[PDB]
Amino acid sequence: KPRIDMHSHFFPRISEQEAAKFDANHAPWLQVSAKGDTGSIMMGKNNFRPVYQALWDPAFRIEEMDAQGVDVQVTCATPVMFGYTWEANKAAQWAERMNDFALEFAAHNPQRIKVLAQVPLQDLDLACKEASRAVAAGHLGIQIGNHLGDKDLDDATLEAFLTHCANEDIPILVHPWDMMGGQRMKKWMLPWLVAMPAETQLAILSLILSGAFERIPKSLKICFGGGGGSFAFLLGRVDNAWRHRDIVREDCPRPPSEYVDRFFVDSAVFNPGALELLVSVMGEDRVMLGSDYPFPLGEQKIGGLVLSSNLGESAKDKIISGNASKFFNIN
């Protein structure tokens, strides 16, 4: 009965040169200090965002997985690696290259470290190919971004991808990215605080209200990050709209709240009360422990929030261990 944290990130050892072979303006790459303790994700010549050793160093990662008490970690690509705006073939190469890095990262000790794969989601055919290929090679599932430009999960291209995954029994983690807002949310990390949970909610409602869950096989294992954003809280607002407006009701047959039996969320909500509403809405079976390691905005003491909760001992075990062992079939 170990701790399994199923939402962490990594960034591969890519040089400006190798990145430039893909796109000297848009391919992210990794610059490490000469010491080797600090580092920066770089976009072309520009500095994207400063980072640290646990993101790229698998040996170093463990030592922190030890002091935190985490026994198995699922990790996946930092969202800046997605490449959804690039040209299909170039992106398909990129995903493959990235997914091999993830295996090299993982293979250092593939018992405590599982990976998820990225896919050229702008191109359905290549995206399925990469998903299958990658899982067959070791990955325990896929992580995708919650939208693709003006396409939300209700889009047929994205509904088809989910359907491929269900049929192939490949678990998906859905991550918000490329946040809405435009020029309204520069300061104070507002995009992490306002737009990310809104993106996630939108993803979730898009599946539910479009009807998608009626068409997508119940075998689909799908998980949303950040506790489903602000979903659980505004659900009542949503049922109410379904109950009193035909246009909200058109493509959605059952009341939206019944659909929480079709997906999973992570536990990253940062507040005991918020976590108790979340479990209430989702059930102890559908909530998995996620940290967002090693980003500053993640919980510094992984598992801490759940562990301190006024929750059943069985509930805690599930969220901390049980649910992801099933979901990702880690054993």
Give the residues lining the site for a second copy (CB under 8 A). Answer: 147, 150, 152-154, 180-185, 187-190, 192-195, 197-198, 201-202, 205-206, 209-210, 226, 229-230, 232-241, 244-245, 247-248, 250-252, 268-271, 273-274, 277, 280-281, 296-297, 299-300
User: Contact between 96 and Zn ion (CB under 5 A)?
Assistant: no
Q: Which does 181 bind (CB under 5 to 8 A by kind): a second copy, Zn ion, none?
A: a second copy
Closer residue to Zn ion in complex, CB, 216/278: 278
Closer residue to a second copy in complex, CB, 108/301: 301
Residue 292 assigned as binding residue: yes
Q: Which does 65 bind (CB under 5 to 8 A by kind): a second copy, Zn ion, none?
A: none
| Token couple for 7 | 């939402």
Closer residue to Zn ion in complex, CB, 78/210: 78
Using DSSP, state whether 274 is helix, strand or coil. helix
| Closest to 80 measured CA to CA, from 207, 179, 222, 180 | 179
Q: CB of 268: closest distance to Zn ion in angstroms?
A: 8
**Residues paired with 330 in a beta bridge:** none
Number of residues that bind Zn ion (CB under 5 A): 1
Choose which of 5, 57, 154, 292 interacts with Zn ion (CB under 5 A): 292
Residue 26 assigned as binding residue: no
Q: Which does 292 bind (CB under 5 to 8 A by kind): a second copy, Zn ion, none?
A: Zn ion
Per DSSP, helices labelled H in the chain are 16-23, 58-67, 88-107, 124-136, 156-167, 190, 196-210, 212-215, 231-244, 246-249, 272-282, 304-307, 313-317, 323-327
319 close to 306: Cβ distance less than 8 angstroms? yes
Burial class (CB in 10 A: 0-12, 13-18, 19+), 16: middle
Q: CB of 306: closest distance to a second copy in angstroms?
A: 13
Cα–Cα distance, 158 to 147 (Å, whole number): 9
| Token couple for 237 | 């607002």
Phi, psi (rounded to 5 degrees) for 175: -115, 135
Closer residue to a second copy in complex, CB, 168/239: 239
Q: CB of 90: closest distance to a second copy in angstroms?
A: 26
* Known binding-site positions for Fe(3+): 7, 9, 175, 292
